[PDB]
Amino acid sequence: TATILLVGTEDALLQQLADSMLKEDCASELKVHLAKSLPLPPRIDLIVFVVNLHSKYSLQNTEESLRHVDASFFLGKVCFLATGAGRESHCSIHRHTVVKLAHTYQSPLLYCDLEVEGFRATMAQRLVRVLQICAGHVPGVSALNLLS
């Protein structure tokens, strides 16, 4: 009844995030699809671009994939999720690049270390709520209202 597309090149992290989102409990029935890239080879309510700040390939793949997304998706139905930004080991230039990306496509930029169980759990809560909003399940709040 609410469907999210996770786009990212790290299968394992996408899977653990998906599992985190599916972890109990949710009033709506959540479906998760994963893609390594866009364009894809089903109704999709929310797209989350998971960007690995330690991987230049991740950045490039996000940048390229974005070109295939219809503009109506950026009306609150796209979120960026940067991983590695809280770590001193990450490249600052990449972080700036993704901040500029999220700004350009006027979409939220969220940060999480997906390798940390608790942090990923909380982020999954946030994303479940955003997904429900985008799917029209939250009274008085549409994807349009997410725009800020």
Author numbering: 15 to 55, 61 to 167
What's the publication's text?
In vertebrates, a group of at least 16 inner kinetochore proteins, collectively identified as constitutive centromere-associated network (CCAN), neighbors the CENP-A nucleosome. The CCAN (whose subunits are indicated as ‘CENP’—for centromeric protein—followed by a letter) interacts with the outer kinetochore and contributes to maintain centromere identity by participating in CENP-A loading at every new cell division cycle. In this study, we concentrate on four additional CCAN subunits, CENP-H, CENP-I, CENP-K, and CENP-M. These proteins have been shown to be proximal to the subunits of the CENP-T/W/X/S, CENP-O/P/Q/U, and CENP-N/L complexes in cell lysates, but their organization and pattern of interactions remain unclear. In this study, we elucidate the molecular basis of CENP-M's essential function in kinetochore assembly.
We generated crystals of residues 1–171 of CENP-M (a fragment identified by limited proteolysis) and determined their crystal structure by the SAD (single-wavelength anomalous diffraction) method to a resolution of 1.5 Å using a SeMet derivative. The structure of CENP-M1–171 is globular and consists of a five-stranded parallel β-sheet surrounded by six α-helices. Structural superposition with representative members of different families identified Rab proteins as the closest structural homologs of CENP-M. Thus, HsCENP-M has the fold of a small GTPase, but may be unable to bind (and therefore hydrolyze) GTP. Experiments with MANT nucleotides confirmed this prediction directly. CENP-M is devoid of all essential sequence signatures associated with nucleotide binding, hydrolysis and conformational switching of small GTPases. An invariant feature of CENP-M is the presence of leucine at position 52 (of HsCENP-M), equivalent to Gln61 (Q61) at the end of the Switch II region of Ras. Thus, the first step leading CENP-M to diverge from genuine GTPases might have been an impairment of GTP hydrolysis, followed by the loss of other features associated with GTP handling. In conclusion, we identify CENP-M as a ‘pseudo G-protein’, in analogy to inactive kinase domains, indicated with the term ‘pseudokinase’. CENP-M (∼20 kDa) elutes as expected for a monomeric species.
